[PDB]
Design an enzyme around this catalytic site. Structure first.
Site, PDB file in Angstrom:
ATOM      1  CD  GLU A   1      15.320  34.692  36.142  1.00  0.00           C
ATOM      2  OE1 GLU A   1      15.690  33.532  36.418  1.00  0.00           O
ATOM      3  OE2 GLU A   1      14.226  35.161  36.515  1.00  0.00           O
TER       4      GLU A   1
ATOM      5  CG  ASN B   1      12.228  25.128  37.634  1.00  0.00           C
ATOM      6  OD1 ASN B   1      12.023  25.228  36.426  1.00  0.00           O
ATOM      7  ND2 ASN B   1      12.932  26.018  38.317  1.00  0.00           N
TER       8      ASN B   1
ATOM      9  CG  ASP C   1       7.657  22.223  37.611  1.00  0.00           C
ATOM     10  OD1 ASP C   1       8.867  22.113  37.316  1.00  0.00           O
ATOM     11  OD2 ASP C   1       6.918  23.088  37.096  1.00  0.00           O
TER      12      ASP C   1
ATOM     13  CB  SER D   1      10.079  22.315  34.197  1.00  0.00           C
ATOM     14  OG  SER D   1      10.021  23.258  35.251  1.00  0.00           O
TER      15      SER D   1
ATOM     16  CG  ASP E   1      13.930  27.885  34.972  1.00  0.00           C
ATOM     17  OD1 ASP E   1      12.901  27.391  34.485  1.00  0.00           O
ATOM     18  OD2 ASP E   1      13.919  28.568  36.011  1.00  0.00           O
TER      19      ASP E   1
ATOM     20  CG  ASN F   1       9.824  26.160  33.183  1.00  0.00           C
ATOM     21  OD1 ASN F   1       8.826  25.522  32.862  1.00  0.00           O
ATOM     22  ND2 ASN F   1      10.563  25.853  34.239  1.00  0.00           N
TER      23      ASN F   1
ATOM     24  CG  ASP G   1       1.734  33.969  27.504  1.00  0.00           C
ATOM     25  OD1 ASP G   1       1.036  33.784  26.483  1.00  0.00           O
ATOM     26  OD2 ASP G   1       1.786  33.156  28.452  1.00  0.00           O
TER      27      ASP G   1
HETATM   28 NI    NI Z   1      12.811  30.173  37.008  1.00  0.00          NI
END
Ligand code: NI
Ligand code: CL
Length: 129
Positions: free
Chosen positions: A35, A46, A48, A50, A52, A59, A101
């Site tokens: 990551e 990202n 969209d 957003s 990270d 995110n 989650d």
């Molecule tokens: Ni990601």
């Protein structure tokens, strides 16, 4: 901060990630490697809108507030900048919420594609834990 592999493994263990929700320590080190390359300051935008943040690329659409992601839920109740600290506490605490989650570590795309089903305990080999 850029962590060494064993240094990060030890920090994650001290913060209680070893076998958290059944995921052995190697899974967490592997996820962090792919990551962020072990870099606490890593950020990536990202499609969209957003972003990270940090060692586990958490995110801003769901987990932290960065002030520029409309409709953010901020479920970890933290500014995203806190996830970039040399101290990984905030990232670990938020990651514990994420992995609880429902989809487990599949929430991390790099984990699913590059760690899941591999010999992840290679990631902690040779480490004094
Ligand atoms: Ni990601
Ligand atoms: Cl699971």
């Amino acid at each position: 901060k850029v962590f060494g592999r064993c240094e990060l493994a030890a920090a994650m263990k001290r913060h209680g990630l070893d076998n958290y929700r059944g995921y052995s320590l190697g899974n967490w080190v592997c996820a962090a490697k792919f990551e962020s390359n072990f870099n606490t300051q890593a950020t990536n935008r990202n499609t969209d809108g957003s972003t990270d943040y940090g060692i586990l690329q958490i995110n801003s659409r769901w987990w932290c507030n960065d002030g520029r992601t409309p409709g953010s839920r901020n479920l970890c109740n933290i500014p995203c900048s806190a996830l970039l600290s040399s101290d990984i506490t905030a990232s670990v605490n938020c990651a514990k919420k994420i992995v609880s989650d429902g989809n487990g570590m599949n929430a991390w795309v790099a984990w699913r594609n590059r760690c899941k089903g591999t010999d992840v305990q290679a990631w902690i080999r040779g480490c004094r834990l």
